[PDB]
Scaffold this motif. Structure first.
Motif, PDB file in Angstrom:
ATOM      1  N   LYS C  18     -29.831  12.230 -15.341  1.00 45.74           N
ATOM      2  CA  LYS C  18     -29.249  10.930 -15.043  1.00 45.74           C
ATOM      3  C   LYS C  18     -28.035  10.558 -15.754  1.00 45.74           C
ATOM      4  CE  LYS C  18     -33.383  10.180 -12.707  1.00 45.74           C
ATOM      5  NZ  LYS C  18     -34.053  11.474 -12.406  1.00 45.74           N
ATOM      6  N   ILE C  19     -27.234  11.413 -15.645  1.00 46.00           N
ATOM      7  CA  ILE C  19     -26.010  11.407 -16.353  1.00 46.00           C
ATOM      8  C   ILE C  19     -24.695  11.369 -15.478  1.00 46.00           C
ATOM      9  CG2 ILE C  19     -24.184  12.592 -17.795  1.00 46.00           C
ATOM     10  CD1 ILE C  19     -27.014  12.148 -19.076  1.00 46.00           C
ATOM     11  N   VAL C  20     -23.962  10.309 -15.673  1.00 48.53           N
ATOM     12  CA  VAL C  20     -22.885  10.114 -14.662  1.00 48.53           C
ATOM     13  C   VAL C  20     -21.428  10.358 -15.370  1.00 48.53           C
ATOM     14  CG1 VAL C  20     -24.024   8.484 -13.333  1.00 48.53           C
ATOM     15  CG2 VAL C  20     -22.514   7.640 -15.293  1.00 48.53           C
ATOM     16  N   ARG C  21     -20.289  10.359 -14.502  1.00 51.59           N
ATOM     17  CA  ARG C  21     -19.052  10.419 -14.923  1.00 51.59           C
ATOM     18  C   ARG C  21     -18.349   9.251 -14.341  1.00 51.59           C
ATOM     19  NH1 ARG C  21     -15.334  12.816 -11.216  1.00 51.59           N
ATOM     20  NH2 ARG C  21     -16.626  14.420  -9.490  1.00 51.59           N
ATOM     21  N   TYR C  22     -17.021   9.054 -14.745  1.00 48.28           N
ATOM     22  CA  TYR C  22     -16.196   7.753 -14.067  1.00 48.28           C
ATOM     23  C   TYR C  22     -15.134   8.325 -13.306  1.00 48.28           C
ATOM     24  CZ  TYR C  22     -19.689   5.512 -17.239  1.00 48.28           C
ATOM     25  OH  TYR C  22     -20.850   5.088 -17.775  1.00 48.28           O
ATOM     26  N   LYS C  23     -14.644   7.289 -12.605  1.00 44.52           N
ATOM     27  CA  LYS C  23     -13.619   7.752 -11.671  1.00 44.52           C
ATOM     28  C   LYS C  23     -13.102   6.534 -11.064  1.00 44.52           C
ATOM     29  CE  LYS C  23     -11.354  11.225 -10.884  1.00 44.52           C
ATOM     30  NZ  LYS C  23     -10.666  12.032 -12.224  1.00 44.52           N
ATOM     31  N   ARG C  24     -11.741   6.322 -10.673  1.00 43.67           N
ATOM     32  CA  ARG C  24     -10.912   5.350 -10.254  1.00 43.67           C
ATOM     33  C   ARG C  24     -10.936   5.488  -8.520  1.00 43.67           C
ATOM     34  NH1 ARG C  24      -9.397   0.795 -12.169  1.00 43.67           N
ATOM     35  NH2 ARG C  24     -10.403   1.569 -14.201  1.00 43.67           N
ATOM     36  N   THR C  25     -11.264   4.662  -7.966  1.00 40.25           N
ATOM     37  CA  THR C  25     -11.499   4.567  -6.545  1.00 40.25           C
ATOM     38  C   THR C  25     -10.119   4.375  -5.784  1.00 40.25           C
ATOM     39  OG1 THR C  25     -12.245   2.416  -6.421  1.00 40.25           O
ATOM     40  CG2 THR C  25     -13.699   4.190  -6.639  1.00 40.25           C
ATOM     41  N   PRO C  26      -9.863   4.553  -4.609  1.00 39.47           N
ATOM     42  CA  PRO C  26      -8.716   3.958  -3.851  1.00 39.47           C
ATOM     43  C   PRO C  26      -8.587   2.642  -3.863  1.00 39.47           C
ATOM     44  CG  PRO C  26      -9.699   5.780  -2.602  1.00 39.47           C
ATOM     45  CD  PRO C  26     -10.823   5.284  -3.386  1.00 39.47           C
ATOM     46  N   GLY C  27      -9.630   1.654  -3.891  1.00 38.85           N
ATOM     47  CA  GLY C  27      -9.389   0.149  -4.008  1.00 38.85           C
ATOM     48  C   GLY C  27      -9.287  -0.348  -5.328  1.00 38.85           C
ATOM     49  N   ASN C  28      -9.054   0.453  -6.380  1.00 41.64           N
ATOM     50  CA  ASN C  28      -8.685   0.172  -7.682  1.00 41.64           C
ATOM     51  C   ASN C  28      -9.814  -0.267  -8.473  1.00 41.64           C
ATOM     52  OD1 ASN C  28      -7.280  -0.134  -9.919  1.00 41.64           O
ATOM     53  ND2 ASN C  28      -6.182  -1.852  -9.523  1.00 41.64           N
ATOM     54  N   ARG C  29     -11.119   0.453  -8.554  1.00 39.29           N
ATOM     55  CA  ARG C  29     -12.466   0.099  -9.052  1.00 39.29           C
ATOM     56  C   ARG C  29     -12.755   1.191  -9.561  1.00 39.29           C
ATOM     57  NH1 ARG C  29     -17.118   0.374  -7.533  1.00 39.29           N
ATOM     58  NH2 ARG C  29     -17.071   1.933  -5.808  1.00 39.29           N
TER      59      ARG C  29
END
Ligand SMILES: [K+]
Ligand SMILES: [K+]
Ligand SMILES: [K+]
Ligand SMILES: [K+]
Ligand SMILES: [K+]
Ligand SMILES: [K+]
Ligand SMILES: [K+]
Ligand SMILES: [K+]
Ligand SMILES: [K+]
Ligand SMILES: [K+]
Ligand SMILES: [K+]
Ligand SMILES: [K+]
Ligand SMILES: [K+]
Ligand SMILES: [K+]
Ligand SMILES: [K+]
Ligand SMILES: [K+]
Ligand SMILES: [K+]
Ligand SMILES: [K+]
Ligand SMILES: [K+]
Ligand SMILES: [K+]
Ligand SMILES: [Mg+2]
Ligand SMILES: [Mg+2]
Ligand SMILES: [Mg+2]
Ligand SMILES: [Mg+2]
Ligand SMILES: [Mg+2]
Ligand SMILES: [Mg+2]
Ligand SMILES: [Mg+2]
Ligand SMILES: [Mg+2]
Ligand SMILES: [Mg+2]
Ligand SMILES: [Mg+2]
Ligand SMILES: [Mg+2]
Ligand SMILES: [Mg+2]
Lengths: 66, 98, 99, 50, 91
Positions: C18-29
């Motif tokens: 249950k490990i995640v990473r983080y990323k920026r989406t095309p809707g600025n999120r």
RNA sequence: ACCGGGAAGGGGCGUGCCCGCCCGUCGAACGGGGAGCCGGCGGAGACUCCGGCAGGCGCGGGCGGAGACGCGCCCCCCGGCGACGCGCACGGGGACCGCGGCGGGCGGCGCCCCGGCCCGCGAACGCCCCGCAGCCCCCGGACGCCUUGCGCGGAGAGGGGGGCCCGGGGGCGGACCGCGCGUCCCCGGCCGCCCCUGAAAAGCCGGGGGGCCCGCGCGCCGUACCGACCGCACAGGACUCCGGGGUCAGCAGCCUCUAGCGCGGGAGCGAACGCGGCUCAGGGAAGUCGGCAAGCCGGCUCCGUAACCUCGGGAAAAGGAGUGGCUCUGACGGGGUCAGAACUGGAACGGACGCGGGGAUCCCGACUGUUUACUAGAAACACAGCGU
């Protein structure tokens, strides 16, 4: 989605594997909707002329610009 | 560095009275380069054409934001609240009422 | 700004799957994206070292040709272990018979 | 809980549905003076063990 | 420059546990951290991995030995006596 | 009712043959597990709806290479994946965070201001390229290669040329531009540690031996909201996840952007007395069963440190000195630190905040640890060691 070399593009058309084509003006984008993937080819407007004339009459084309 | 150009349009500056030489005169004496004012006439020239100020340079380049700063400085004397400076195109500003 | 996010899974107990990473989406999120565990590749039956040529993907997702090596005992022995079995076989036959 | 069995959901669903007043035409029909249904319950002071 | 005078590796214990215990550990713990010789490698790369279990870091062979040293003195004598008994069985 | 292997214990098919020792579709809404991302819409639902782009599981219409390696099935046996501890450090990626440019928008403006504030966005997935360490191949035959630390080599080093793995990056698809110190998260190769050595199975795959493109579909259950929970309703009790800026050694204290805004109600007066705080001349424990309570000390740098000792300690022993602001200089390969000097201010500078009082002895228990939940934390219990 994936890109394609021009010669493969007609063969998919030649075997009726396309469902719709879209011409996009920006270098022109041609997008073909098959059962599995959407394929995109980029050409200058000089080159897209001849390809569309070759366009299968059984293959719906649409246009788009803005 | 090379030469670029900017201009500020004061078309709405007719019914109320605004000299074009004064605004040109304001910019001529206040323009700073490297926080100094020696060696500006030889880089930055204020014109008056089309009722609008024109800043042509030669070998000097700078941001369009500073041309907007000197406009609100000069307008702060007896126009506190009359004009809002807006962008119309590349290199051209436009003065607009409220 | 404020970049804090909420949990993506059914419960928040942060176990090893249950490990995640983080990323920026095309809707600025700022979105969360699960980080799968990577299985090991197969290991040699005689030496315990990784077998060469097989990617670290579960074999259900690899084509048949991708799961094999082209040698006798292709994915079982590491190449050196084969050569040692071949010599032992041939030489013992030469010593259990004809002296 | 947000994770409940269908059997507990159904017995909770029945306590919600029957938690009602006497209709007013029933009070005229049956000629009643006690008008409160004393089998009602309220979530803050109840201990539904279901 | 030498950092301690007597305690050696038992400096990790501080002032605790008394002198007789720390004296015993200096000898025991020096022995179990040592490098021994592969009976096969012939190289000096054997290290303990658990009590009784010794592995060459070069051979990769694994061996059964003593708790805190590779060979014990009882097992040396046993191997020596067992060998002489077999050869005596030969006519 | 309680206890239990010693029992003629079932399958593949296709008749008829063949194979076979003997339970559990009980037990995890954190362990294992085939596969999901972006945008949008509503008063109340969304990884579930709508649009778009994908992925998984099903069903129907023998060649190349010198080599490392590259490019349908069935039964018996041998294996693999699933599948695993802790740790100071070092390295790589992502996200976050800053500084500068440039583009668009704001604010206030007595003087100054190109010096303040806000916004500049790109997913899963498919194809190509690129990937340190690490393991492998070929030539050939050695006073070297190399890490912060190590480590490695005639059981074949270095050097030249290659193969495989690598939760990652790039380019094209899907569809604004540079440079930095840190922080968190995951990953890598090592090294250290244990009288401690850190799950299992379903499921899926390989080996040896023998016999032999286009369509359609994916059922059942949960899904609103809440610290609205337990304490007769309540300063108590109640597991986990995400975590910006300044000062700073910092997840401490103190101030703050984003977000959020209750806490059985108000006004007047300024008595005693209480409860929580502050300051006091001269003296300095004379007070008291008793220094109880309060106060002194405290950050960082340099100087200087005794008895005794199980030689590890004692030790921040005891004691001293310096510390702001401003203008500069030197050292290290763009970055903070370290060192030094002039000038200056009630004779000031860890200016708030945070933060040991010290020493000489006697008794008891070696030590860290445990306890009378709600009047006892100890000299009592435990402990390694020793002995029967
Ligand atoms: K619910
Ligand atoms: K209740
Ligand atoms: K019985
Ligand atoms: K279970
Ligand atoms: K569990
Ligand atoms: K489960
Ligand atoms: K497991
Ligand atoms: K095999
Ligand atoms: K829901
Ligand atoms: K009063
Ligand atoms: K009184
Ligand atoms: K006294
Ligand atoms: K006190
Ligand atoms: K200073
Ligand atoms: K005690
Ligand atoms: K302790
Ligand atoms: K008591
Ligand atoms: K007590
Ligand atoms: K105590
Ligand atoms: K006790
Ligand atoms: Mg079950
Ligand atoms: Mg699970
Ligand atoms: Mg909601
Ligand atoms: Mg486990
Ligand atoms: Mg919800
Ligand atoms: Mg006093
Ligand atoms: Mg007295
Ligand atoms: Mg007295
Ligand atoms: Mg004690
Ligand atoms: Mg204690
Ligand atoms: Mg008590
Ligand atoms: Mg007490």
């Amino acid at each position: 989605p994936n890109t394609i070399t021009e010669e493969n593009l007609m063969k998919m058309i030649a075997d009726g594997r396309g469902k719709k084509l879209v011409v996009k003006s920006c270098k022109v984008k041609l997008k073909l909707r098959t059962a599995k993937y959407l394929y995109t080819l980029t050409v200058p407007n000089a080159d897209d002329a001849k390809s569309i004339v070759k366009g299968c009459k059984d293959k719906v084309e649409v246009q788009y610009v803005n | 560095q090379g030469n670029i150009r900017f201009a500020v349009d004061c078309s709405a500056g007719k019914d109320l009275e605004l000299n074009l030489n004064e605004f040109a005169d304001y910019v001529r004496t206040h323009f700073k380069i490297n926080n100094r004012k020696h060696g500006v006439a030889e880089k930055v020239a204020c014109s008056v054409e089309g009722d609008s100020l024109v800043i042509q340079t030669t070998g000097y380049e700078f941001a369009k934001r500073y041309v907007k700063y000197l406009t609100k400085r000069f307008l702060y004397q007896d126009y506190q609240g009359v004009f809002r400076v807006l962008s119309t195109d590349k290199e051209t500003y436009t003065l607009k009422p409220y | 700004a404020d970049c804090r996010v909420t949990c993506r899974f059914h419960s928040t107990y942060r176990t090893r799957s249950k490990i995640v990473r983080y990323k920026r989406t095309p809707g600025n999120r700022l979105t969360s994206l699960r980080v799968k565990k990577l299985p090991n590749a197969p290991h040699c039956a005689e030496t315990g070292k990784q077998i060469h040529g097989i990617p670290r993907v579960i074999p259900q997702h690899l084509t048949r040709q991708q799961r094999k090596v082209s040698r006798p005992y292709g994915g079982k022995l590491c190449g050196s272990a084969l050569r040692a079995h071949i010599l032992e076989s041939f030489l013992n036959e030469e010593n259990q018979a004809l002296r | 809980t947000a994770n409940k069995t269908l059997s507990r959901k159904l017995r909770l669903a029945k306590k919600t549905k029957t938690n009602k007043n006497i209709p007013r035409w029933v009070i005229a029909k049956d000629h009643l003076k006690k008008t409160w249904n004393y089998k009602r319950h309220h979530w803050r002071r109840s201990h539904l063990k279901l | 420059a030498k950092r301690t005078k007597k305690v050696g590796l038992t400096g990790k214990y501080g002032t605790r546990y008394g002198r007789a215990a720390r004296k015993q550990l200096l000898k025991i713990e020096t022995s179990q951290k040592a490098k021994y010789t592969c009976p096969f490698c012939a190289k000096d790369k054997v290290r303990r991995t658990a009590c009784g279990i010794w592995t060459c870091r070069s051979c990769s062979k694994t061996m059964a030995g003593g708790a805190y040293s590779l060979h014990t003195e009882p097992a040396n004598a046993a191997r020596a006596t067992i060998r002489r008994l077999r050869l005596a069985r030969e006519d």
